[PDB]
RNA sequence: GAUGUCGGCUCAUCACAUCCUGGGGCUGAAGUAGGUCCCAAGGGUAUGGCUGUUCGCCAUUUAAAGUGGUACGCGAGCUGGGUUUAGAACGUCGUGAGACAGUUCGGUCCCUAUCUGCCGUGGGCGCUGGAGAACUGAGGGGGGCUGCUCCUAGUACGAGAGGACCGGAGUGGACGCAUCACUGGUGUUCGGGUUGUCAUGCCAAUGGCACUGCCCGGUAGCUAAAUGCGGAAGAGAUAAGUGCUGAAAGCAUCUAAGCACGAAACUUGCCCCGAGAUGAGUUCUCCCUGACCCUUUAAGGGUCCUGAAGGAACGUUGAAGACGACGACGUUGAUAGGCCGGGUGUGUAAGCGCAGCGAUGCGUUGAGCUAACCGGUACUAAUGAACCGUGAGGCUUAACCUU
RNA sequence: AAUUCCUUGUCGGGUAAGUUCCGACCUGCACGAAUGGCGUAAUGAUGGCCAGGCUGUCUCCACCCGAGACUCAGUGAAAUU
RNA sequence: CACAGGUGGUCAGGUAGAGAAUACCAAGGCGCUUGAGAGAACUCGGGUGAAGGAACUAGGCAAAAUGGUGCCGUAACUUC
RNA sequence: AGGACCGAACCGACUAAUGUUGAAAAAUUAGCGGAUGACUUGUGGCUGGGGGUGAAAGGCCAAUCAAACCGGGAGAUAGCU
């Protein structure tokens, strides 16, 4: 079914009465307001566009304000779309709370991974480090060979090399839903999720099931 | 390590297409002193936002 | 008028004559376990002792430790033990200088990347008025491994010994992604102990230097050994193979018409990129509703007025970052620093008093100090402006306003 | 064997496993007595081998401190073609 | 070359120290003739490291480690 | 007493890294050897090219050595590019 947009508050632990410590990531899921409903007739597919949080009225551009005004909802920090599974009906301006995850038991969490910047092959691709001694000359962490001889006189596409690492969309699948606190708009999921504290997270019911 | 052919003057100009300098869009004017200055920088006479910062 | 070699290291990529896993026929296939052939290249496919070795033998693992191509892949990527200079010996040959594809000890491995290629990241213009967002998904990548235990069941099978198919459950190895709550590492920006010496007039107390002087701890961050998750199920069309009905050929026949099954391969399903997809797409929202002149009179040029949406620039900056970029904020403000409170770390500061001849001990006192952390706070800096971007957006045709 | 081609000779020692090493054997391809033979304490930046200690050499790399690399201003090369 | 090289003699303070070693200083002399930022890969020179401890490798290369004075004690072998 | 021992100056150059269009046409850094002697060093002198000198490597003889350098024979010769 549809998902929700939340914020990564941080990580903590839940102590069970049986003596087990569950590592949980706290996700703040405020009410998600439906800003637009897309249908086959007009958009060619079924989905709902939602917003969450609050944004400075001084920093909301007029094109954005008009979009929010049409839906009759307060502006949020962004817009996200969720596809509808042929059985979901929503109306513009509807508020979706964290109670939607009451009986899900497993969710998929998507976020932007921490940015590692320009990373070497050792860190990025787990390349094996060459000898630190035994005559090695300025080639301790270098990639090594990157191809074959004249026959393929070129480096193949997709070759694992150094470059930007992290700061990209990442999804972690099948995370247990430890707790759903509707009063505090909190969602506790066992384990870690991508992104740093305060980053946006997209939570959907597990697709693998 | 070194070129096999001499690059052309056309190639040299193509590489330098990104070397052009950018001029300051505009200069701020002090409200009281009235002289031009870089934005968020003090004027040549020691003024800033019409406060007459140290000018010794 | 130079295409550097054996082996090792790093990094690979393809073939299938398949080592493992998967699907099958036959069996001198009871079962378990095998033999042989067919299909199958998705993924996976040991560490050590000896030796320069590849190889090989050996030790011990594994579901398996596949065979080959790639300048016997890979030295403008590393190595230099071997081959293959000059030194020096042994055996051997020669009268001798010397020699051996015999041995033995020793013996300089350069290159700042122009182009192609590849990994990343921007600028320009385009997409036909401009602008801010959210998308569709043509297409392209990633991923695809598997053990053991238990139940079914000591059942089928078998004289016994032994011991399943099918199906289900749990828990691991290797690998991959993310993360820092826990366990830890680091923590020359925090605290303390301590040696030598110099200095602050001296005592006391501190600071400099000696690898952070040497050390003991340790915040945030980063991080693995730490802890979460992943490989799938399902669907479509099939390979080998198994069939149903059924003639040619009164029979038979899986095939010729027709119909049904069938694998980690194929197309999907999962994850990521993605409209420069010039075939430049879709949706929502926002902004601009002047006056004249010239003429070679048209998608023409020029002047005056106008300058929107928005953008950029500058500033404060970020768990974003080589630089660009990207994100937050700029007084109608918590963006950064400072400040306040707290936490954390270190471990009872200084001063004074007491006890002691003294080194020290004790009280004040879990004191003082405390980075990047948490919660707050306009004290400082984020200035009014200026700048870019315009003024309703071509032609043809069709249906509607004027079904 | 600094000498042995066959050859990683055979046996023993050391190791879970030893083409090296050590001790014997003698079938010395092709040792041998001043181009010396065999021993030899001490000595050696000498060759080979085995242990204790020690460790980032390695399993398997992580973090940190500095100098470059990166950006800005000034100066301003080279091989090659 | 205003070049991390080479170049004989003389002078020889303080504290610690066996010392002309070494550390910190006196007299005296210098900061080495591009700077300013940033805090990526990678290279160079260093610091620390969980568990293991030569499994690395041609080879313990490199690194780590040992390190002073006094007393006790000290094997095979030996040319004593 | 000692071509004795440890270890600075001094004289050497065993290992590694760096550098290799270097700071340097052989050095730097961390270790390393000798360090009263067959030691080291200043100044001056002598030995000359088929010659010198050589604790012997074909080493050294002005960054040149299986026959130095400079000038000359000389436009050696080149069935080769």
From Swiss-Prot, chain A:
GO molecular function, one term: structural constituent of ribosome
UniProt-listed GO biological process terms: cytoplasmic translation; ribosomal large subunit assembly
Keyword terms: Methylation, Ribonucleoprotein, Ribosomal protein, RNA-binding, rRNA-binding
Post-translational modification remark: Methylated by PrmB.
InterPro entries: Ribosomal_uL3, Ribosomal_uL3_bac/org-type, Ribosomal_uL3_CS, Transl_B-barrel_sf
Domain of life: Bacteria
Presence of keyword NADP: no
Modified residues (N5-methylglutamine): 150
Cellular compartments per GO CC: cytoplasm; cytosol; cytosolic large ribosomal subunit
Cited Pfam families: Ribosomal_L3
Keyword Cell wall biogenesis/degradation: no
Function statement: One of two assembly initiator proteins, it binds directly near the 3'-end of the 23S rRNA, where it nucleates assembly of the 50S subunit.
Subunit structure, interactors included: Part of the 50S ribosomal subunit. Forms a cluster with proteins L14 and L19. In pull-down experiments interacts with CedA.
NCBIfam families according to UniProt: L3_bact (TIGR03625)
Stored PANTHER family: 50S RIBOSOMAL PROTEIN L3 (PTHR11229), LARGE RIBOSOMAL SUBUNIT PROTEIN UL3C (PTHR11229:SF16)
Descriptive protein name: Large ribosomal subunit protein uL3
Gene: rplC
């Amino acid at each position: 079914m549809i998902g929700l947009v939340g914020k990564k508050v941080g990580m903590t632990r839940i102590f069970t009465e049986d003596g087990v410590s569950i590592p949980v990531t706290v996700i703040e899921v405020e009410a998600n307001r439906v800003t637009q409903v897309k249908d086959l007739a007009n958009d060619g597919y079924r989905a709902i566009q939602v917003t969450t949080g609050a944004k400075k009225a001084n920093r909301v551009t007029k094109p954005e304000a008009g979009h929010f005004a049409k839906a009759g909802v307060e502006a949020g920090r962004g817009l996200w779309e969720f596809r509808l599974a042929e059985g979901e009906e929503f109306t513009v301006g509807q508020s979706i709370s964290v109670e939607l995850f009451a009986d899900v038991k497993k969710v998929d969490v998507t976020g932007t991974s921490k940015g590692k910047g320009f990373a070497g092959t050792v860190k990025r691709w787990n390349f094996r480090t060459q000898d630190a001694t035994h005559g090695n000359s300025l080639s301790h962490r270098v990639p090594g060979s990157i191809g074959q001889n004249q026959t393929p006189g070129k480096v193949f596409k997709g070759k694992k090399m150094a470059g930007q690492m992290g700061n990209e969309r990442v999804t972690v699948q099948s995370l247990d839903v430890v707790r759903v606190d509707a009063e505090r708009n909190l969602l506790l999921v066992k384990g870690a999720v991508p992104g740093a504290t305060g980053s946006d997270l997209i939570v959907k019911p597990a697709v693998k099931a | 390590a070194v070129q096999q052919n001499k690059p052309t003057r056309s190639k040299r100009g193509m590489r330098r297409s990104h070397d052009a300098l950018t001029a300051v869009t505009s200069l701020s004017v002090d409200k009281t002193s009235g002289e031009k200055h870089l934005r968020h920088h003090i004027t040549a006479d020691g003024y800033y936002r019409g406060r007459k910062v140290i000018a010794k």
